[PDB]
Design a protein around this ligand. Structure first.
Ligand code: HEM
Ligand code: HEM
Ligand SMILES: N#Cc1ccc(CCNCc2ccc3ccc(N)nc3c2)cc1Cl
Ligand SMILES: N#Cc1ccc(CCNCc2ccc3ccc(N)nc3c2)cc1Cl
Ligand SMILES: C[C@H](O)[C@H](O)[C@H]1CNc2nc(N)[nH]c(=O)c2N1
Ligand SMILES: C[C@H](O)[C@H](O)[C@H]1CNc2nc(N)[nH]c(=O)c2N1
Ligand SMILES: [Cl-]
Ligand SMILES: [Cl-]
Ligand SMILES: [Zn+2]
Lengths: 404, 416
């Protein structure tokens, strides 16, 4: 039947009725739960049914279901699909869809913000060069000298029997990973593949630890093109610690803008293979994951040794102590630099509020507990103690294969 | 490729397939439309105490399955002894509605239930379990003796030893053996005149029950509760554990000298007493078991949960942190020092304990052992990942597949 949803800190119970509006399958079955899997395993009226549902959402949202503006808009959509196998969205529909896709994203702890999203229509875009211009404009608007603003730029939708618009980079700002000869990696190991791809497309690589990568941009059925981001567009914060002077030394830095560019935005059955979006960072993404993950910069032992800790044994919690100072250095540095950032306590607190707003507005909120709970200090945050139901609502941000 | 769940580790980049989930005979809470893996007690993780016997062929099929598991585990699968055992069980169930386990079947079952528990990070140890057969027990008084014996053996003056005591199974038209308490050692929770709680809020209800059944209550933060033990069709009787049987560890910190003055302590033995042990369709409603603690259970959940002892702010204030802003990370700092104290104090007291790093590292090893042995390992990620320092442990980066195998430790309704 319905999921009874309990908060174990408060004893409060909700019932999620919004999940009944889900008509796309997640990975689980009654025989086995696969909720911890990062990625999924892998006519014209499926399209039509998806489109009417989106249009119905849209008019429900703006005061006017059943109105004949609703009825003829519906009628435009089948005429177009019946004739061409596809259709097109109006700008206001795209703006609404983009916001619903973020609202529906189970893994985002930042959805309290979901109605505040600058949407750039970049669907009149016929070249990699024009993509670059749009992206440069996205970054200038979003970065806003450190007062970050959420934004999405939407490039032309996929079309049958034509290649996709793609941004090859997973983010607009990424540090190069240089595979070294002897096993190791200089820079960000998460970016070895895209660094190599950049070099094979004629980029002159640096040899630093934090070299900003160029963008590879691809118009349909053309080779990707390389574009170096102008340094003045890419805001970076040098990392220092509020009390440990030696930390600043470490030569650590991170960029301001989390701008994800490899997800597919799906609205009413239409698919936008290139729709980069950005918000601002939660400090644990940088301080815990990007800098402390063993397969990332992996700096835990470095900091721990500078902190003069007992590396020899795990029960001294040297890892735990080191990680706390690194997260504090990230909070400190961003706040010093006047670059928007939110700590995981503030962030999960606002997500609890979002859940409550959502329960009231929709009768639920799809949420992926393993992603909502931060990577340090889990049970110290209120979301740890909150049961959640995970499901797929459309419009949706989806994963899609790397274009190479 | 393979039509089994593909399982990836994102630290190492390595891939496995779970074929063990194919032997799952029981549905979990999830459907293709909605994942409920974050619910603690979804009703598909709960049972119901039916006073009448199981429909004999539902019982028979579970029984046959377990007997096959047993003969497979001693590599006599298909043998004449195997086929004779099945026939014997079919006979027993036919004339009495139930059947009985041989001793070594009971031992195999108890270890398998542990081995199959998706929420236990301690499972590297699953082959080392002392099984106390107490299916002869016939009074609440005798349950007490069996429990004291268990506690003495398991505690072992701080050098802790995993053990389980198994009291008689559910029987057709006869009341259950039940332990009312949730653990053998629990601190009291006294609801206050002003609405707060002195002691452990987790235990308000069992405390009130002990009082109702005649216990004279104390009023400390760490009063050990009496046991409420229930023999078939008898009211629960009250038993007080002799204080010297209950090993406790006072908490101090290795460098923050004031920490000892908080007067915090915890008991050495985690002994869970309210779970149902299910083996081949047989139901052991009283089967308490114990291992030893992972330090985050004490340092993080029991002492720092807002609805538990909730000492975070207290410790943070002693540490002189900025508690009126989140971005100071005062909660994080306090939490580390409280875990350090738990680890340090147990270590000083020579009482077995394992930190969350060491625990999760051993669980990765357990996963690889089980990959080879059985083609998978049912694992509940949300419970396996520790409540602090999540991505700092190897298990965070390990995808897991969750499902119900039997023999199993299951939840059951409170006896009242
Ligand atoms: C405004 C501040 C925001 C914050 C603090 C925030 C926070 C987060 C965090 C911490 C994650 C987990 C990501 C990871 O661990 O890899 C996440 C995921 C996600 N976020 Fe947000 N976010 C923000 C804005 C946005 C915006 C503007 C969008 C889209 C318009 C968005 C869409 C998503 C999606 C689709 C995911 C899933 C990530 C994935 O599957 O890779 N977020 N968010
Ligand atoms: C040997 C040392 C052991 C360690 C370090 C250990 C560790 C843990 C931890 C940390 C949990 C999570 C509990 C929670 O967060 O509430 C757990 C759960 C569990 N353990 Fe183990 N454990 C050990 C031994 C055992 C033994 C001996 C048994 C039974 C024979 C067992 C059966 C279970 C079961 C069934 C759960 C699920 C908890 C639940 O569903 O409520 N464990 N263990
Ligand atoms: N394959 C794969 C894969 C798939 C997903 C991921 C997670 C990447 N998510 C990054 C992300 C996405 C959206 C965000 C929105 C806001 C924000 N502050 N950070 C985000 C960070 C990582 C990998 Cl390696
Ligand atoms: N309702 C409910 C509910 C359901 C489950 C739980 C979890 C209790 N888990 C306790 C436990 C069980 C076995 C253990 C084995 C070893 C160990 N160190 N700790 C354990 C701790 C708590 C509640 Cl309140
Ligand atoms: C295996 C596991 O599901 C995987 O590492 C997930 C867990 N939770 C996460 N949570 C966030 N926010 N980001 C992540 O990348 C992950 N990774
Ligand atoms: C709501 C959520 O399921 C609940 O807080 C869970 C999360 N993970 C857990 N993990 C462990 N080991 N123990 C727990 O009690 C819980 N509680
Ligand atoms: Cl926020
Ligand atoms: Cl262990
Ligand atoms: Zn699931």
């Amino acid at each position: 039947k319905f999921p009874r949803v309990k908060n174990w800190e408060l004893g409060s119970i909700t019932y999620d009725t919004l999940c009944a509006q889900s008509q796309q399958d997640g990975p689980c079955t009654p025989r086995r739960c696969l909720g911890s899997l990062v990625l999924p395993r892998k006519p014209a009226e499926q399209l039509l049914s998806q489109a009417r549902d989106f249009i119905n959402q849209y008019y429900s949202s703006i005061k006017r279901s059943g109105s004949q503006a609703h009825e003829e808009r519906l009628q435009e959509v089948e005429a177009e699909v019946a004739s061409t196998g596809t259709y097109h969205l109006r700008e206001s529909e795209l703006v609404f869809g983009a916001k619903q896709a973020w609202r529906n994203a189970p893994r985002c702890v930042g959805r309290i913000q979901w109605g505040k999203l600058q949407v750039f229509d970049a669907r009149d875009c016929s070249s990699a060069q024009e993509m670059f211009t749009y992206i440069c404009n996205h970054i200038k608007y979003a970065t806003n000298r450190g007062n970050l603003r959420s934004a999405i730029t939407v490039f032309p939708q996929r079309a049958p029997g034509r290649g996709d618009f793609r941004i090859w980079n997973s983010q607009l700002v990424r540090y190069a990973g240089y595979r070294q000869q002897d096993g190791s990696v200089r820079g960000d190991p998460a970016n070895v593949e895209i660094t190599e791809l950049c070099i094979q497309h004629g980029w002159t690589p640096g040899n630093g630890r934090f070299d900003v990568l160029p963008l590879l941009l691809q118009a349909p059925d053309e080779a990707p093109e390389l574009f170096v981001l102008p340094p003045e567009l890419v805001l970076e914060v040098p990392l220092e610690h509020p009390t440990l002077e030696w930390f600043a030394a470490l030569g650590l830095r991170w960029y301001a803008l989390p701008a994800v560019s490899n997800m597919l935005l799906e609205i009413g059955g239409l698919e936008f293979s290139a729709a980069p979006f950005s918000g601002w960072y939660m400090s644990t993404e940088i301080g815990t994951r990007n800098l402390c993950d063993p397969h990332r910069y992996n700096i835990l032992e470095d900091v721990a040794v500078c902190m003069d800790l007992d590396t020899r044994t795990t029960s001294s919690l040297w890892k735990d102590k080191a990680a706390v100072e690194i997260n504090l250095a990230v909070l400190h540095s961003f706040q010093l630099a006047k670059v928007t950032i939110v700590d995981h306590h503030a962030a999960t607190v606002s997500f609890m509020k979002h859940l409550d707003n959502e329960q009231k507005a929709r009768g639920g909120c799809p949420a992926d507990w393993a992603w909502i709970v931060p990577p340090i200090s889990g049970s110290l945050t209120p979301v740890f103690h909150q049961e959640m139901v995970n499901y797929i609502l459309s419009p949706a941000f989806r994963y899609q294969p790397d274009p190479w």
